[PDB]
Design a protein around this ligand. Structure first.
Ligand SMILES: Cc1cc2nc3c(=O)[nH]c(=O)nc-3n(C[C@H](O)[C@H](O)[C@H](O)COP(=O)(O)OP(=O)(O)OC[C@H]3O[C@@H](n4cnc5c(N)ncnc54)[C@H](O)[C@@H]3O)c2cc1C
Length: 366
């Protein structure tokens, strides 16, 4: 019965914590942010698209809770393209995706954890790790604090501190790249009345991923359960910077480029969101290997392969990481040293393809 320190209570980390509690490991999930469920309190997006692969990975870890967690997801049967004239054209789907709320999926995973042996330590920032040949010494900041574990699993985001600590122990080929891409989260409220055709209070087609393809920028919309739409604008930081110098400049920009949103969105609210948007940069990372030899550490999710939003699906990719790691662990009879090794040897070549294609689709647009 071994113990594991999982650094990062995000979607990937919480899932890994669930899959390691399922197998019998004494899991201890950490995160420097407070409990997201707590009212007194880190959402990069209101919702996201989960693929069949991301769903199958959910089932492989908990078939029961899966259909309970994903009970509010909305399937997309294709893309709905809005042109400059405001005309909509449907483009049916290769791989099916479903819209699901991020905070709900995150909280649901957390709830399933507290219904198990695992232990949740929020407000614990990992600062340092020392590597022995038996147990790893994890230093936190909450006020110094230290606990020892058999192995540490990093799921602490693109700026992974776990990754940095691993680099002091292993020769890691590592590359980080900051993109010009920026995103602004907008909101399309539900209609006042139920719409028979859409099957809810939706201003537009709920079973479609709406896209407003423009030159070097983009608007998208995913349906929420309550009828509203989570909307996201994608563009370079330069374009946005030039826009937000004037409320009228932003307002006239939206009307000109997305004329068919005037009936479904308050422009004054979108202008406000544009100007006061968190100017947070997007970074892409690649690692090799993802594991410390001896099976003492491993990287999953954005910590290992952070990629471009929309063009790449990081959550689905992160979920697939966990499922493959479990297949290997249950193929090598719990031998983490041999399982973590085969992970890198097989997962890296897939991740190289995925991240590059996503990066290639992005550079194409911009
Ligand atoms: C706008 C947007 C839209 C997206 N849409 C999709 C989509 O539709 N489909 C899809 O598959 N993906 C999508 N993604 C990507 C997806 O959100 C991420 O790839 C996914 O959340 C990865 O989760 P993670 O747990 O690996 O990293 P994170 O979500 O960042 O989790 C890391 C956690 O670790 C914690 N942490 C950080 N540092 C420390 C530390 N030093 N000590 C302790 N804890 C720490 C943080 O608090 C954080 O909660 C989107 C991303 C963005 C930005």
């Amino acid at each position: 019965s071994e113990s594991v320190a999982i650094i990062g209570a995000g979607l990937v980390g919480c899932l890994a914590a669930l899959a390691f509690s399922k197998e019998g490991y004494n899991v201890t999930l950490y995160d420097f942010r407070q409990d997201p469920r707590l009212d007194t309190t880190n959402l990069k997006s209101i919702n996201l698209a989960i693929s069949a692969r991301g769903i199958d990975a959910l089932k492989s870890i908990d078939p029961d809770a899966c259909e309970h967690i994903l009970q509010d997801m909305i399937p997309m049967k294709g893309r709905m393209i809005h042109d400059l004239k405001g005309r909509q054209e449907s483009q049916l789907y290769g791989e099916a995706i479903n819209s699901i709320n991020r905070s709900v999926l995150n909280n649901s995973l957390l709830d399933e954890l507290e219904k198990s042996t695992t232990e949740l330590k929020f407000g614990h920032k990992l600062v340092k790790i020392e590597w022995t040949d038996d147990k790893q010494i994890c230093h936190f900041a909450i006020t110094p604090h230290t606990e020892k574990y058999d192995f540490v699993i990093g799921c602490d985001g693109a700026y992974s501190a776990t990754r940095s600590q691993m680099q002091r122990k292993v020769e890691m080929d590592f590359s980080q790249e900051y993109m010009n891409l920026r995103y602004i989260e907008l909101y399309i409220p539900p209609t006042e009345e139920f719409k028979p055709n859409y099957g809810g209070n939706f201003a537009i087609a709920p079973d479609h991923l709406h896209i407003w393809p423009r030159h070097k920028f983009m608007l998208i919309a995913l349906a929420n359960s309550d009828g509203s739409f989570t909307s996201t604008f994608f563009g370079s930081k330069d374009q946005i910077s030039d826009l937000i110098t004037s409320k009228s400049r932003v307002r006239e920009f939206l009307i000109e480029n997305f004329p068919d949103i005037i009936n479904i969105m308050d422009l004054d609210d979108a202008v406000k969101r544009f100007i006061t948007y968190p100017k947070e940069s997007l970074v892409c990372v690649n690692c090799k290997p993802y594991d410390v030899p001896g099976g003492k550490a491993i990287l999953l999710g954005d910590a290992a392969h952070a990629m471009v939003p929309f063009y790449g699906q990081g959550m689905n990719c992160g979920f697939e990481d966990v499922r493959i790691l479990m297949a290997l662990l249950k193929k090598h009879s719990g031998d983490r040293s041999r399982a973590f090794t085969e992970y890198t040897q097989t997962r890296h070549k897939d991740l190289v393809s995925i991240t590059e294609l996503a990066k290639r689709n992005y550079k194409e647009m911009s």
